[PDB]
Design an enzyme around this catalytic site. Sequence first.
Site, PDB file in Angstrom:
ATOM      1  N   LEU A 141      38.285 -16.416 -14.018  1.00  0.00           N
ATOM      2  CA  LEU A 141      39.637 -16.482 -14.556  1.00  0.00           C
ATOM      3  C   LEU A 141      40.688 -15.846 -13.660  1.00  0.00           C
ATOM      4  O   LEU A 141      41.857 -16.226 -13.746  1.00  0.00           O
ATOM      5  CB  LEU A 141      39.692 -15.816 -15.940  1.00  0.00           C
ATOM      6  CG  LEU A 141      38.683 -16.335 -16.968  1.00  0.00           C
ATOM      7  CD1 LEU A 141      38.847 -15.616 -18.300  1.00  0.00           C
ATOM      8  CD2 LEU A 141      38.818 -17.840 -17.145  1.00  0.00           C
ATOM      9  N   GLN A 181      41.247 -13.298  -9.720  1.00  0.00           N
ATOM     10  CA  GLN A 181      40.679 -12.576  -8.589  1.00  0.00           C
ATOM     11  C   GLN A 181      41.782 -11.860  -7.825  1.00  0.00           C
ATOM     12  O   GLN A 181      42.833 -12.447  -7.549  1.00  0.00           O
ATOM     13  CB  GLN A 181      39.919 -13.519  -7.649  1.00  0.00           C
ATOM     14  CG  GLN A 181      38.416 -13.553  -7.881  1.00  0.00           C
ATOM     15  CD  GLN A 181      37.643 -13.941  -6.633  1.00  0.00           C
ATOM     16  OE1 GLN A 181      38.193 -13.973  -5.532  1.00  0.00           O
ATOM     17  NE2 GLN A 181      36.357 -14.232  -6.800  1.00  0.00           N
ATOM     18  N   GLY A 182      41.533 -10.598  -7.488  1.00  0.00           N
ATOM     19  CA  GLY A 182      42.422  -9.839  -6.632  1.00  0.00           C
ATOM     20  C   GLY A 182      41.678  -9.256  -5.449  1.00  0.00           C
ATOM     21  O   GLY A 182      40.588  -9.722  -5.106  1.00  0.00           O
ATOM     22  N   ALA A 183      42.255  -8.237  -4.814  1.00  0.00           N
ATOM     23  CA  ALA A 183      41.601  -7.553  -3.705  1.00  0.00           C
ATOM     24  C   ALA A 183      40.841  -6.309  -4.138  1.00  0.00           C
ATOM     25  O   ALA A 183      39.867  -5.931  -3.479  1.00  0.00           O
ATOM     26  CB  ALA A 183      42.628  -7.169  -2.636  1.00  0.00           C
ATOM     27  N   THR A 184      41.264  -5.667  -5.227  1.00  0.00           N
ATOM     28  CA  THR A 184      40.580  -4.494  -5.752  1.00  0.00           C
ATOM     29  C   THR A 184      39.637  -4.820  -6.902  1.00  0.00           C
ATOM     30  O   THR A 184      38.747  -4.015  -7.199  1.00  0.00           O
ATOM     31  CB  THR A 184      41.602  -3.448  -6.221  1.00  0.00           C
ATOM     32  OG1 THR A 184      42.731  -3.452  -5.338  1.00  0.00           O
ATOM     33  CG2 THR A 184      40.985  -2.056  -6.226  1.00  0.00           C
ATOM     34  N   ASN A 201      37.986  -8.342  -9.604  1.00  0.00           N
ATOM     35  CA  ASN A 201      37.820  -9.767  -9.858  1.00  0.00           C
ATOM     36  C   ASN A 201      37.499  -9.964 -11.331  1.00  0.00           C
ATOM     37  O   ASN A 201      36.610  -9.294 -11.866  1.00  0.00           O
ATOM     38  CB  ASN A 201      36.708 -10.363  -8.986  1.00  0.00           C
ATOM     39  CG  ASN A 201      36.850  -9.993  -7.522  1.00  0.00           C
ATOM     40  OD1 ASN A 201      37.545 -10.669  -6.763  1.00  0.00           O
ATOM     41  ND2 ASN A 201      36.187  -8.916  -7.117  1.00  0.00           N
ATOM     42  N   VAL A 202      38.209 -10.883 -11.981  1.00  0.00           N
ATOM     43  CA  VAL A 202      38.124 -11.077 -13.425  1.00  0.00           C
ATOM     44  C   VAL A 202      37.431 -12.403 -13.710  1.00  0.00           C
ATOM     45  O   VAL A 202      37.909 -13.467 -13.296  1.00  0.00           O
ATOM     46  CB  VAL A 202      39.511 -11.034 -14.084  1.00  0.00           C
ATOM     47  CG1 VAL A 202      39.427 -11.498 -15.531  1.00  0.00           C
ATOM     48  CG2 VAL A 202      40.092  -9.632 -14.003  1.00  0.00           C
ATOM     49  N   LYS A 220      36.366  -7.168 -15.537  1.00  0.00           N
ATOM     50  CA  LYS A 220      37.140  -6.883 -14.331  1.00  0.00           C
ATOM     51  C   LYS A 220      36.243  -6.082 -13.389  1.00  0.00           C
ATOM     52  O   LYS A 220      36.163  -4.856 -13.474  1.00  0.00           O
ATOM     53  CB  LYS A 220      38.426  -6.129 -14.671  1.00  0.00           C
ATOM     54  CG  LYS A 220      39.422  -6.049 -13.527  1.00  0.00           C
ATOM     55  CD  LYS A 220      40.752  -5.466 -13.976  1.00  0.00           C
ATOM     56  CE  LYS A 220      41.778  -5.507 -12.854  1.00  0.00           C
ATOM     57  NZ  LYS A 220      43.102  -4.974 -13.281  1.00  0.00           N
ATOM     58  N   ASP A 256      56.097  -5.472 -13.948  1.00  0.00           N
ATOM     59  CA  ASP A 256      56.344  -6.910 -14.042  1.00  0.00           C
ATOM     60  C   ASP A 256      55.790  -7.432 -15.367  1.00  0.00           C
ATOM     61  O   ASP A 256      54.651  -7.899 -15.439  1.00  0.00           O
ATOM     62  CB  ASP A 256      55.717  -7.640 -12.852  1.00  0.00           C
ATOM     63  CG  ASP A 256      56.195  -7.102 -11.514  1.00  0.00           C
ATOM     64  OD1 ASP A 256      57.132  -6.276 -11.502  1.00  0.00           O
ATOM     65  OD2 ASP A 256      55.631  -7.504 -10.475  1.00  0.00           O
TER      66      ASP A 256
HETATM   67  C1  LIG Z   1      43.699  -8.986 -16.425  1.00  0.00           C
HETATM   68  C2  LIG Z   1      43.939  -9.483 -17.847  1.00  0.00           C
HETATM   69  O1  LIG Z   1      43.337 -10.757 -18.096  1.00  0.00           O
HETATM   70  C3  LIG Z   1      42.782 -11.013 -19.326  1.00  0.00           C
HETATM   71  O2  LIG Z   1      42.597 -10.075 -20.075  1.00  0.00           O
HETATM   72  C4  LIG Z   1      42.404 -12.394 -19.750  1.00  0.00           C
HETATM   73  C5  LIG Z   1      42.947 -13.549 -19.184  1.00  0.00           C
HETATM   74  C6  LIG Z   1      42.611 -14.847 -19.557  1.00  0.00           C
HETATM   75  C7  LIG Z   1      43.170 -16.125 -19.006  1.00  0.00           C
HETATM   76  O3  LIG Z   1      44.090 -16.041 -18.232  1.00  0.00           O
HETATM   77  C8  LIG Z   1      42.604 -17.460 -19.394  1.00  0.00           C
HETATM   78  C9  LIG Z   1      42.985 -18.680 -18.814  1.00  0.00           C
HETATM   79  C10 LIG Z   1      42.477 -19.936 -19.167  1.00  0.00           C
HETATM   80  C11 LIG Z   1      42.941 -21.250 -18.485  1.00  0.00           C
HETATM   81  C12 LIG Z   1      43.746 -21.005 -17.194  1.00  0.00           C
HETATM   82  C13 LIG Z   1      41.816 -22.248 -18.194  1.00  0.00           C
HETATM   83  C14 LIG Z   1      41.533 -19.888 -20.194  1.00  0.00           C
HETATM   84  C15 LIG Z   1      41.122 -18.696 -20.813  1.00  0.00           C
HETATM   85  C16 LIG Z   1      41.649 -17.439 -20.429  1.00  0.00           C
HETATM   86  O4  LIG Z   1      41.253 -16.252 -21.044  1.00  0.00           O
HETATM   87  C17 LIG Z   1      41.656 -15.001 -20.586  1.00  0.00           C
HETATM   88  N1  LIG Z   1      41.076 -13.911 -21.190  1.00  0.00           N
HETATM   89  C18 LIG Z   1      41.436 -12.611 -20.785  1.00  0.00           C
HETATM   90  N2  LIG Z   1      40.857 -11.553 -21.389  1.00  0.00           N
END
Ligand SMILES: CCOC(=O)c1cc2c(=O)c3cc(C(C)C)ccc3oc2nc1N
Length: 610
Positions: free
Chosen positions: A16, A18-21, A23-24, A39, A127
């Site tokens: 879902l 990815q960064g440099a420090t 990856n999620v 993460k 941000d």
């Molecule tokens: C670093 C914080 O990031 C989260 O916390 C987080 C983010 C997401 C998503 O951006 C996401 C995106 C999609 C589509 C682009 C296919 C589907 C499901 C997603 O589910 C997420 N769940 C999270 N916990």
Amino acid sequence: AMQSTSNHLWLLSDILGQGATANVFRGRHKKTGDLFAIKVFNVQMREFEVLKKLNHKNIVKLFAIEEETTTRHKVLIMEFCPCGSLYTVLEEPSNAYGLPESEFLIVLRDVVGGMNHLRENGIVHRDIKPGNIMRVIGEDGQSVYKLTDFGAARETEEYLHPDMYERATVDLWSIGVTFYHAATGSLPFRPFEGPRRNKEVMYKIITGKPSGAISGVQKAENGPIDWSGDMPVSCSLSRGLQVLLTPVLANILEADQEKCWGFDQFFAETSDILHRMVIHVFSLQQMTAHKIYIHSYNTATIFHELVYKQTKIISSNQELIYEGRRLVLEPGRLAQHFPKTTEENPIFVVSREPLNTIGLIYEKISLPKVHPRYDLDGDASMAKAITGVVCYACRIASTLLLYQELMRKGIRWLIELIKDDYNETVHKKTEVVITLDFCIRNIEKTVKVEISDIHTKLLRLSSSQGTIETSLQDIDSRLSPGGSLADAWAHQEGTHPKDRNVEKLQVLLNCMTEIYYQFKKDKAERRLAYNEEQIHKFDKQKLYYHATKAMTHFTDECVKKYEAFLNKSEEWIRKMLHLRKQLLSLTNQCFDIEEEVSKYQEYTNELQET
Ligand SMILES: CCOC(=O)c1cc2c(=O)c3cc(C(C)C)ccc3oc2nc1N
């Protein structure tokens, strides 16, 4: 391949972010199987622990922290949001020109509550953007928005401050940009083409922003900038919400940070809007729907003032109808004790004095030309814009049908209301002739036992009363189903729910959404096969045919019959107000006459020598 910890595991295709420090990805629990965000970070635990202690409804709850198996990478387990982020919600063509009102108030509520909870515990977030706002389905089916990504370490662009774009109040700037984007479906400060290209022009629009304005768009190559401190016509919110939302944006997007609104007065003005209740009102003579935002403790006098600000109708002329009957609001009745109203069942406001006709104000939009050139990114963006246009046509068509149905229901109730005024005057006339034609023979009862001054004038009452009698039967003749104030043309003009025009447009919309979503899959896989390529171009030509048929059925049926129903409604409005004026005259004449019958019922009784 798949990495894992002591309690969790996750593949790599289910990525879902990815960064440099860190990856999620998304992963499961070894012992339960539930879904979690992970993460994998690629001392510092001090702020990880204090963030782990947090607990708020509008905050992505950081559950636990574990070590990976292969590398001892410190991973963070977070709550999974299957619906994605607010940026994802703003890309569905249903929200191409703005979120619905209920969903917008949900965003404003959860974002303000989450930021207040972060300042309350002392956490800074630079941000705040639609990408940092996550959507999770609540237990009551309604969306719940949670904040995330507040605390990182590095080495967007349209949400930065004039101090920062050269590379809290600075964060309140990105809030106003986010709220304008969620309310309008577009960015407030748009140069020509991408803002990433004209980054130098973006600095001109931000720093050179005139005070009070919230939007600035360059609609031509190296052209001018159109400024506005008002919401666009395509805004999905009602005018009652735009008037309360615009001053917030204008005073939090202030350039010089010395005159930003400040979070304290910001949280106060936002909570003022959220603590209000909504009252649906429909102007029958203007054919306009309205939503009055009023606190639960305000009086009906303030309610009449808010209806004035939306309709320019003096409070002394506001007359209300509800569920068929009259509605008299006492000047001190609190707002929380009003009858509950919905969009389908509102309060009807009508004035005895003539009002102009407006109808529904919407921006006429055409279909953008489709480029026959094969481009994955180009056709995916073209499909998104054209589908959002058909979504706007679906919303306008459904709003036009609601206006016509509310006009039909409101007109029917108004006629049955005038009928009650008619039966009231007839009841009063029958109540006074019972003494007029009675006391006139009480006089001749004494004649058989000068006076002609009474008779030669009392006969001038029944003379001026039969003229009202023939004037009342003429008014009743217009209320007959064949009279001049008929109720059948509303059943002959315009569109009806049995036409199912909204369903036809939504069917073509679902086909266009299916093609657009497949184009969204094609853009990722940057290369397609020969057969898949032909399917891509086949469905693009089907997009043109679908939208062309939708716009044809919209203008040549939904709009045309709407204009005919409205144009035929304006002449009925004028004739209705003419009948109310005549009936009011014939009503007050019975009152000015009943005071004369009461004046002469006792003069005939003289004093006696006893
Ligand atoms: C670093 C914080 O990031 C989260 O916390 C987080 C983010 C997401 C998503 O951006 C996401 C995106 C999609 C589509 C682009 C296919 C589907 C499901 C997603 O589910 C997420 N769940 C999270 N916990």
